[PDB]
Every structure is written in C-alpha cells, then in structure tokens.
C-alpha cells in the first residue's frame, strides 16, 4: 500500500522565564519513530521504534544537531510573529510546523508538504506544486516574498522528492516486520438494552493498523445514520487502534441491522450482525 513520513514540531513561548517548550515527533505511517523534547534530560533526538535503533552515531548526532537548530528557528519565529502581529511580550504563543512526503504502492514519490501555523491557524504553506506558497494574511505575505527571494521552495522540493522519499524507503525496509504488516480489525458486536423494548448494538473494531478505517451501519441493506453514534478512532497504546459504531434498535429487530467494516488489511469488507 501507500506510505508516508511526517515530522511535527510545536514550540510554545514562556514569557515568564526561559526558552520556549519545543516538542518534535517523527512518524512513518501511524508509527512514531523519533522524538525530541526540550524539557527531557538527553537533549538528543531519541528513538521510539526498534527499527530506528540500528542507525549509527552519525545519524543520531546529525538528527540531534538538526532538531536543535529547528528549535532555535522556532524561537526566533515566535519573536518575529509577536512583532508582525503587534502583540505584547506577556502572553504565550505557539508555532506549529509539519512537513513530509507520501509514496504510493510502488514507493515512488506521490506528494510533499510543508505547513506552518501561528496560534493554531494557518500561516504559510507550500502548495502541492512544491514551487508556490499559500499565505493566509499580510504577515504571511511578507514571509512569502522573503522565501521567494531565498529559494526556499527549491530547497524544500529537493528534500521532499529526494531525501524524504529515500529515507522513507530505508525505514520501510528496516522496519518491514511491523511497518509493512497490516493488522486487520478484530471485530465483534455487543448488545446493551436501553429499555425493555429497545437496545443499543455496538460494532467494535479493535487492534488494527494502520489507523484508517470505515464503520457503517445498514438497515435492510441501506445506510443508516439516524440513531447512530461513531467515536473517533483512538490509540490502544500498543501501536494499534480502536473504533466503534453503535445504533439503537427496537428489540427483536436486530437481524435487520448490519455493520460494515472497511480497512486496508481486509481483502473484502466485513459484515457483522448481532448473534441472538
């Protein structure tokens, strides 16, 4: 199937004392593999998946140098933005950055991204052409003219179509035992009476990977959204995910209702009904 590599960075200013709090995380698909936290003791990029631990000292020293340099860029940016938006030195503000690449089933480049936000709102983003910029307001328009003059999109395009995809392929190979394994959802249905004549049917999908999944209810073979509830996909904590969908039904009529589960690990979607 398709794969992705993504890095996420958050910096939160601390006007009271000291430097911003900085947290960086790296993912391959839905698997975290590296982290940096400015509050942690190591002051190094740290492994979070077994398959990245084999990387040598040059890798760890290099990623530590680069992630600390990213933290300093965010620190400077928080100051610049406070100036661009004419804000007080007294409040805490946040910058967020995400970048990475997607490859298809053949592991060839599909798309690249580099997005930045200030205080939880879009600031500037590289367009899908990897040449152009989306600036949300006039402060970001100032950044856009600066980054056009500094050949920034060229540098990002070279990384996104080159380094990013090359290293994603390396990680997919090194971590093949888990990264290239799909864990189909383990499904079951539960029944919870809500009165002496109606009940909730809850369709569960457990221990699946990757996180993408679709759960839908049908009644007599047509989609049912009335009297249904669908929770957000949630992490189990062991690297897999969970979700459920529920419907309220008249007791005795449970056989009319079917839950349909779609996932990359299922060659054909599953259909579940309540076991009377």
């Amino acid at each position: 199937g398709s794969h992705s590599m993504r890095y996420f960075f958050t910096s939160v200013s601390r006007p009271g004392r000291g430097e911003p709090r900085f947290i960086a995380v790296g993912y391959v698909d839905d698997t975290q593999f590296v982290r940096f936290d400015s509050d942690a003791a190591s002051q190094r990029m740290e492994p979070r998946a077994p398959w990245i631990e084999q990387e040598g000292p040059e890798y760890w020293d290099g990623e530590t140098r680069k992630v600390k340099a990213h933290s300093q860029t965010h620190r400077v940016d928080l100051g610049t933005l406070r100036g661009y938006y004419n804000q007080s030195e007294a409040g805490s503000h946040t910058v967020q950055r995400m970048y990475g690449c997607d490859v298809g089933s053949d592991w060839r480049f599909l798309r690249g991204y580099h997005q930045y936000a200030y205080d939880g709102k879009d600031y500037i983003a590289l367009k899908e052409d990897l040449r152009s910029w989306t600036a949300a307001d006039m402060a970001a328009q100032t950044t856009k003219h600066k980054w056009e003059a500094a050949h920034v999109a060229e540098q990002l395009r070279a990384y996104l179509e080159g380094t990013c995809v090359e290293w994603l392929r390396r990680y997919l190979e090194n971590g093949k035992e888990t990264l290239q394994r799909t864990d189909a959802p383990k499904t079951h249905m539960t029944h919870h009476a809500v009165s002496d004549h109606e009940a909730t049917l809850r369709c569960w999908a457990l221990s699946f990977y990757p996180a993408e999944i679709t759960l839908t209810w049908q009644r007599d073979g047509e989609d049912q959204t009335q009297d249904t509830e669908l929770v957000e996909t949630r992490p189990a904590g062991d690297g897999t995910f969970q979700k459920w969908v529920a419907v309220v039904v008249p007791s005795g009529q449970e056989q009319r209702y079917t839950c349909h589960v779609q996932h990359e690990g299922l060659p054909k979607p599953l259909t579940l009904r309540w076991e009377p």
Binding site: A69, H70, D77, T80, Y116, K146, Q155, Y159, C164
Partner: peptide
C-alpha cells in the same frame, strides 16, 4: 531524516 537549515519567517 529531518530537513537541515530552515529559513526563518
């Protein structure tokens, strides 16, 4: 692998 030098805003 991370990007290297970033351009400030």
């Amino acid at each position: 692998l991370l990007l290297d030098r970033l351009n400030q805003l």
